Amino acid sequence: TRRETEV
Amino acid sequence: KPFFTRNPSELKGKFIHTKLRKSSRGFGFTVVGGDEPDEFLQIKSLVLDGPAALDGKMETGDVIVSVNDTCVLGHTHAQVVKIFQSIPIGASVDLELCRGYPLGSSAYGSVKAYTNFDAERDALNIETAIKTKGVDEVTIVNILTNRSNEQRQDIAFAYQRRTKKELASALKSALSGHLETVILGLLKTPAQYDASELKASMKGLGTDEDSLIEIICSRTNQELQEINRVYKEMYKTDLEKDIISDTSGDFRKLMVALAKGRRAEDGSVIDYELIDQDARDLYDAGVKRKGTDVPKWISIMTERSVPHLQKVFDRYKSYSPYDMLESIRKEVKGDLENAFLNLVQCIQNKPLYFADRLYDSMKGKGTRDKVLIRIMVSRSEVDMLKIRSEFKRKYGKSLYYYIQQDTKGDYQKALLYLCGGDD
Ligand SMILES: [Ca+2]
Ligand SMILES: [Ca+2]
Ligand SMILES: [Ca+2]
Ligand SMILES: [Ca+2]
């Protein structure tokens, strides 16, 4: 829902 | 409007520098932020057994200040993630991180995380107070009450590293009275503190039904799901088992249903038809016919989302001469009634519900310290600012004022620090 990115 | 800036000289936290080389599965952490025009890009989580976590310098809530000698204060989310993804395997990235601005913080709590946090510094100063001849409770109260719970957990770990003795055991021997109760409660996590109180309410063959009703009726799905896991790890027994062992009848059914924490999450769109039907069922099961259909009340009041039930109770006034609270007092009595009344209060206005419980614990002779301590500890990082607002709006004076006149000593000081001043 909240903009999240696996880095 | 959270704090934001794009000049590193205007940041208040502490600065750390790490140098991570990308592995096969990336750098091993999650980035959040960069949605609203002024959102800081923060470390959402770590991936243990990964490059960032095994370095140990990176922690959650950190803010990315610079990536490989290029400032990212103000860059959008897609810009900083393409930087990390353009890196090849084996290449190293230099991250500048700021620690002081938090994430996942409720804007309605009264005790905020310390900006210039230092776990080893507070652990040393507390050790001093414990061995001080006389116990500097002042120091211990000034420190712990001005730290967040997660910060207090780091104090206990730092205290265990430098003393080989747990902070909970050391503070349990040097403190006494209600002050000992408050500090030991602040040292526990929200899940650990609630799980301990629940077991305490069921100790012996009797039951402290009030403490059980308060915690079960006021906790959300996420909080209850974590309590069930922690309670099973602490006492080797599922919480539902000890509830069945200390409750019976429809009261047992309601507490078991609520404790499951499987209430439906709030839906995106409002179901006006189900709002009307749930109100009809609550009226047809209670006031309309003689007797009471308690299972139908338990089903609706436990399974439906909180915003839905708020509109249900308002639509209930269209069918019934009495509102939901007055309907409960007439239809049911005893433990089942007290649990239903507590549940409806938590749905309609939970901060108001805790305000009344605080006033009830102090209005008469003496003080129900068990209820007063639990609320001031569990709601300190949740909705303490809202409870203080509803309190002064209803009772004229401030909650700080009532705690002042009903508690004394350092025990008063500790509770006043958790309040946050007089409104
Ligand atoms: Ca003691
Ligand atoms: Ca009836
Ligand atoms: Ca009193
Ligand atoms: Ca008392």
Author numbering:
A (entry chain C): 143 to 149
B (entry chain A): 456 to 878
Give the article text.
The human proteome comprises 266 human PDZ (PSD95/DLG1/ZO1) domains 16 and about 4000 putative PBMs, defining a network of one million potential interactions. PBMs are mostly (though not exclusively) C-terminal, with their COO- implicated in binding, and are classified based on position −2, being respectively Ser/Thr, hydrophobic or acidic in classes 1, 2, and 3 17,18. PDZ-PBM interactions are rather transient and promiscuous. Viral proteins bearing functional PBMs are found notably in HPV and HTLV oncoviruses as well as in HBV, WNV and coronaviruses including MERS or SARS-CoV213,15,23–26.
The logos of PDZ domains SNTB1 and MAGI1_2 indicate preferences for x-R-E-T-x-V-COO- and R-x-E-T-x-V-COO-, respectively. The oncoviral PBM of HPV35 E6 satisfies both consensus requirements hence recognizes both PDZ domains. The structures of HPV35 E6 PBM bound to both SNTB1 and MAGI1_2 resolve their logo differences by revealing the distinctive contributions of Arg residues at p-4 and p-5 of HPV35 E6 in the two complexes. C MAGI1-2 PDZ logo matches with HPV35 E6 PBM at the same positions, but also at p-5 (Arg), exposed to the acidic β2-β3 loop of MAGI1_2 in the MAGI1/HPV35 E6 complex. Accordingly, HPV35 E6 binds stronger to MAGI1-2 than to SNTB1. Most PBMs in this oncoviral clade share the class 1 consensus E-[TS]-x-V-COO− (where x denotes for any residues), often immediately preceded by basic residue(s). These motifs showed generally high binding affinities with PDZ domains such as MAGI1_2, DLG1_2, SCRIB_1, SNTB1, or TX1BP3.
